[PDB]
Scaffold this active site. Structure first.
Site, PDB file in Angstrom:
ATOM      1  N   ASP A  70       0.786  -1.239   0.000  1.00 45.65           N
ATOM      2  CA  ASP A  70       0.000   0.000   0.000  1.00 45.65           C
ATOM      3  C   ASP A  70       0.819   1.290   0.000  1.00 45.65           C
ATOM      4  OD1 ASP A  70      -0.902  -0.158   3.587  1.00 45.65           O
ATOM      5  OD2 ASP A  70       1.032  -0.311   2.591  1.00 45.65           O
ATOM      6  N   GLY A  85       4.746 -24.508  -1.104  1.00 49.55           N
ATOM      7  CA  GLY A  85       4.675 -23.347  -2.007  1.00 49.55           C
ATOM      8  C   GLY A  85       4.953 -22.030  -1.304  1.00 49.55           C
ATOM      9  N   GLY A  87       3.509 -21.067   1.288  1.00 49.59           N
ATOM     10  CA  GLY A  87       3.478 -21.310   2.725  1.00 49.59           C
ATOM     11  C   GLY A  87       4.821 -21.005   3.352  1.00 49.59           C
ATOM     12  N   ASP A  93       7.375  -4.909   2.566  1.00 50.26           N
ATOM     13  CA  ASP A  93       7.028  -3.796   1.677  1.00 50.26           C
ATOM     14  C   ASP A  93       8.252  -2.918   1.390  1.00 50.26           C
ATOM     15  OD1 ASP A  93       4.237  -1.376   1.678  1.00 50.26           O
ATOM     16  OD2 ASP A  93       5.863  -1.769   0.237  1.00 50.26           O
ATOM     17  N   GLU A  96       8.557   0.793   2.466  1.00 49.67           N
ATOM     18  CA  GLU A  96       9.051   1.224   3.764  1.00 49.67           C
ATOM     19  C   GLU A  96      10.546   1.483   3.634  1.00 49.67           C
ATOM     20  OE1 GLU A  96       6.442   1.723   5.158  1.00 49.67           O
ATOM     21  OE2 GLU A  96       5.254   0.205   4.172  1.00 49.67           O
ATOM     22  N   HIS A 113       8.280 -10.729  14.069  1.00 42.55           N
ATOM     23  CA  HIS A 113       6.822 -10.845  13.952  1.00 42.55           C
ATOM     24  C   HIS A 113       6.434 -11.691  12.722  1.00 42.55           C
ATOM     25  CE1 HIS A 113       2.640  -8.940  14.174  1.00 42.55           C
ATOM     26  NE2 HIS A 113       2.679  -9.380  12.926  1.00 42.55           N
ATOM     27  N   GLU A 114       6.981 -11.357  11.550  1.00 42.51           N
ATOM     28  CA  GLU A 114       6.648 -12.101  10.317  1.00 42.51           C
ATOM     29  C   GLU A 114       7.017 -13.582  10.415  1.00 42.51           C
ATOM     30  OE1 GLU A 114       4.681  -9.085   9.444  1.00 42.51           O
ATOM     31  OE2 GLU A 114       4.707 -10.892   8.203  1.00 42.51           O
ATOM     32  N   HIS A 117       4.537 -15.593  12.166  1.00 40.05           N
ATOM     33  CA  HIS A 117       3.486 -16.039  11.236  1.00 40.05           C
ATOM     34  C   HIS A 117       3.956 -17.219  10.396  1.00 40.05           C
ATOM     35  CE1 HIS A 117       0.754 -12.841  12.160  1.00 40.05           C
ATOM     36  NE2 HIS A 117       1.445 -11.890  11.552  1.00 40.05           N
ATOM     37  N   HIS A 123      -2.072 -13.262  15.528  1.00 45.17           N
ATOM     38  CA  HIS A 123      -1.828 -12.051  16.292  1.00 45.17           C
ATOM     39  C   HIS A 123      -2.189 -12.183  17.740  1.00 45.17           C
ATOM     40  CE1 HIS A 123      -1.729  -9.624  12.371  1.00 45.17           C
ATOM     41  NE2 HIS A 123      -0.497  -9.800  12.815  1.00 45.17           N
TER      42      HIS A 123
HETATM   43  C1  LIG Z   1       6.442  -5.993  14.706  1.00 43.28           C
HETATM   44  O1  LIG Z   1       6.099  -6.555  13.443  1.00 43.28           O
HETATM   45  C2  LIG Z   1       5.074  -6.051  12.681  1.00 43.28           C
HETATM   46  C3  LIG Z   1       4.984  -6.433  11.353  1.00 43.28           C
HETATM   47  C4  LIG Z   1       3.956  -5.932  10.552  1.00 43.28           C
HETATM   48  C5  LIG Z   1       3.004  -5.040  11.075  1.00 43.28           C
HETATM   49  S1  LIG Z   1       1.880  -4.427  10.097  1.00 43.28           S
HETATM   50  O2  LIG Z   1       2.368  -4.560   8.731  1.00 43.28           O
HETATM   51  O3  LIG Z   1       1.779  -3.027  10.421  1.00 43.28           O
HETATM   52  N1  LIG Z   1       0.453  -5.125  10.133  1.00 43.28           N
HETATM   53  C6  LIG Z   1       0.183  -6.244   9.257  1.00 43.28           C
HETATM   54  C7  LIG Z   1       0.744  -7.529   9.841  1.00 43.28           C
HETATM   55  O4  LIG Z   1       0.434  -7.874  10.973  1.00 43.28           O
HETATM   56  N2  LIG Z   1       1.572  -8.239   9.059  1.00 43.28           N
HETATM   57  O5  LIG Z   1       2.168  -9.384   9.562  1.00 43.28           O
HETATM   58  C8  LIG Z   1       3.112  -4.644  12.410  1.00 43.28           C
HETATM   59  C9  LIG Z   1       4.140  -5.145  13.213  1.00 43.28           C
HETATM   60 CA   LIG Z   2      12.624   0.775   0.705  1.00 42.64          CA
HETATM   61 CA   LIG Z   3       3.271  -0.112   3.273  1.00 46.24          CA
HETATM   62 CA   LIG Z   4       7.479 -21.557   1.131  1.00 51.86          CA
HETATM   63 ZN   LIG Z   5       1.214  -9.753  11.568  1.00 53.76          ZN
END
Ligand SMILES: COc1ccc(S(=O)(=O)NCC(=O)NO)cc1
Ligand SMILES: [Ca+2]
Ligand SMILES: [Ca+2]
Ligand SMILES: [Ca+2]
Ligand SMILES: [Zn+2]
Ligand SMILES: [Zn+2]
Length: 158
Positions: A70, A85, A87, A93, A96, A113-114, A117, A123
């Protein structure tokens, strides 16, 4: 939902953000995997060629999944839970500005964080958890998972 059913997991860095030194990208991602391997039986290895379990990608706007980025701000990154795949893959992004520090968006903290997931975590409603959906910088040199994060990951592994 899905979890990896094996202990040795591979990742590959598909491409590198121009925002950072290459070695700093490597190190941020390595350190972010270590956060999770510290508290599970998982072992993570960076591969340079071939199909990894976890592909790390920097991309902007529409980039071939259903989760278009975005521009600067808003969605920073997203990732797919364990599976074949796409997964496991984690996308950052490129609109950023990724950094090793408090400026722009910290790659390491975002990657922790990613990768959560990528391992099957959803979350957290606790602002203290790394898995809380709002990005807030904290000192990365003393970073620690919250008890909620550790409970979540230990519900899936070990
Ligand atoms: C601390 O790690 C993160 C990573 C992403 C985000 S966020 O992009 O703003 N929200 C979407 C999200 O949760 N993606 O995994 C917020 C915090
Ligand atoms: Ca960049
Ligand atoms: Ca963005
Ligand atoms: Ca994969
Ligand atoms: Zn997230
Ligand atoms: Zn994506």
């Amino acid at each position: 939902g899905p979890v990896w059913r094996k202990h040795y997991i591979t990742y590959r860095i598909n491409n590198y953000t121009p925002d950072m030194n290459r070695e700093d990208v490597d190190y941020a991602i390595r350190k972010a995997f270590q956060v999770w391997s510290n508290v599970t039986p998982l072992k993570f290895s960076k591969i340079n060629t071939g199909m990894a379990d976890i592909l790390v990608v920097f991309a902007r706007g529409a980039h071939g999944d259903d989760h278009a980025f975005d521009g600067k701000g808003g969605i920073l990154a997203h990732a797919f839970g364990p599976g074949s795949g796409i997964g496991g893959d984690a996308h950052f992004d490129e609109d950023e500005f990724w950094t090793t520090h408090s400026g722009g968006t910290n790659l390491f903290l975002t990657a922790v964080h990613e990768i959560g997931h990528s391992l099957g975590l959803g979350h957290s409603s606790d602002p203290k958890a790394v898995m809380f959906p709002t990005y807030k910088y904290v000192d990365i040199n003393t970073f620690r998972l919250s008890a909620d994060d550790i409970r979540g990951i230990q519900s899936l592994y070990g």
